[PDB]
Amino acid sequence: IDNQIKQGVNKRREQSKVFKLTNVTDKVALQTTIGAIYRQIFERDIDP
């Protein structure tokens, strides 16, 4: 494990997804991006 996860790129830089907005007339693809804005700007949930 010392040679596995502990190499120097802490493997969530290149397996965390990004969110685009190509689909503004889609509605359910919009809703998971708006939550992704909320979970990156305030980076908790804004629900409570």
Binding site for another protein (CB under 8 A): 1, 3-5, 10-12, 15, 20, 22-23, 25-29, 31, 44-45, 47-48
User: Minimum Å distance from CB 15 to another protein?
Assistant: 7
Query: Is the distance from CB of 46 to CB of 38 less than 8 angstroms?
Result: yes
Residue 18 is classified by DSSP as -
Nearest residue (CB) to another protein, 1 versus 41: 1
Least separation, in Å, of the C-beta of 38 and another protein?
Answer: 13
Alpha helices, H only, the chain: 28-41
DSSP state, 44?
S
